Amino acid sequence: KKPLPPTPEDNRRSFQEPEETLVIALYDYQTNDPQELALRCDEEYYLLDSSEIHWWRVQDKNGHEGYAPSSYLVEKS
């Protein structure tokens, strides 16, 4: 139905992470589905359910309800 697409190779270190539920996930994920707002690479993640080892869920603060995946995401702390 919908596997995981290819991703960029820029992962290196972390950044901050003192926030509460919000984090970062600096990754340029490509996505147009209005259910999962794509991802740029800035502090725009909130929940991020790790339940899925590839398709998480998140609710940014500006209703940017994206669903950051695991491959296009891996930059926090």
Curated annotation (Swiss-Prot):
Disulfide bonds: none annotated. Induction: Through a myriad of surface receptors including the TCR/CD3 signaling complex, coreceptors, or chemokine receptors. It is found in: Cytoplasm; Nucleus. Disruption phenotype: Mice display decreased mature thymocytes and elicit profound defect in CD4+ and CD8+ T-cell development. Additionally, they show a strong decrease of cytokine production in response to TCR receptor stimulation. Impaired TCR-mediated calcium response in gamma-delta T-cells. Loss of Vgamma2-positive immature thymocyte-specific transcriptomic profile, although there is no change to overall transcription factor expression levels. Not required for the generation of IL17A expressing gamma-delta T-cells. Transmembrane segments: none annotated. The modification Phosphotyrosine is found at Y27. Residues 18-77 form the SH3 domain. Belongs to the protein kinase superfamily. Tyr protein kinase family. TEC subfamily. Homooligomerizes; this association negatively regulates kinase activity. Interacts with PPIA/CYPA; this interaction regulates TCR signal strength via a proline-directed conformational switch in ITK. Interacts with THEMIS. Interacts with FASLG. Interacts with VAV1; this interaction is important for VAV1 localization and TCR-induced actin polarization. Interacts with TBX21. The N-terminal PH domain allows ITK to be recruited to the plasma membrane by an activated PI3 kinase. This domain also contains a proline-rich region (PRR). The adjoining domain is a SH3 domain, which binds to PRR (from itself or from other proteins). Next, a SH2 domain is required for binding tyrosine-phosphorylated substrates. In the C-terminal region, the kinase domain is required for tyrosine phosphorylation. This is Tyrosine-protein kinase ITK/TSK.
